[PDB]
Amino acid sequence: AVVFVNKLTLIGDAEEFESRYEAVGAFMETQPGLVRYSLVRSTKDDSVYFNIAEWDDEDTFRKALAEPEFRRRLDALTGLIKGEPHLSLPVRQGRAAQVLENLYFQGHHHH
Amino acid sequence: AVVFVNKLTLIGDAEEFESRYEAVGAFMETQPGLVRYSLVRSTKDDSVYFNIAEWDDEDTFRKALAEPEFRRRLDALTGLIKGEPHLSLPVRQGRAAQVLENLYFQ
């Protein structure tokens, strides 16, 4: 898996930016290789967002990025945000299933 | 849910940073409210990492950070990285959908 992380700086209207991002996320949802994505907004500095997307691999991320209609919805955000994008590799991970498993094992093993 | 994002800049040895971060990840996994976390390293600028940690709510995140053991293991990263921390609220999210989803008319 690869994890796309874009640190966004809001330079326009927050509500307009977020509604337009909706169409980007909608499109990503049936792009091959997309696992999940989240747009999150900092509570410390509300001009700071992060676009975070997990992809099966680098090749599927590459092929999705090139799709004209995806790029059209992405381009509709230019002028509302500036981006500092990072295609990134997982280095250490606490998977949800494993976090849950360690909890219920400690509680139900009765060591 | 809330998503903590820390943009980390490496200022020492990457291998030791990553080994010492193992202890931080381990302790997080024992704390009430943790959903999941990933530490990822940028392939554009390899001095950049992001810690991305998902918690049930701000409350559980704040309560975990009040643990002395958590603070001890964070303090062991001093000199290896610098942080830009952001507790963040999900604004939009989704996951892989079925291409045929709308053709059931359910």
Author numbering:
A (entry chain B): 2 to 112
B (entry chain A): 2 to 107
Reported in the publication:
Rishirilides are a group of PKS II secondary metabolites produced by Streptomyces bottropensis Gö C4/4. Structurally, rishirilide is a tricyclic partially aromatic polyketide with an unusual isopentyl sidechain and a carbonyl group on the third ring. In this study the involvement of one cyclase and two oxygenase in rishirilide biosynthesis was investigated. For this purpose, excision of rslC3 gene using the markerless time-saving CRISPR-Cas9 system, inactivation of rslO4 gene using Redirect® technology, and crystallization of RslO4 and RslO1 proteins were carried out.
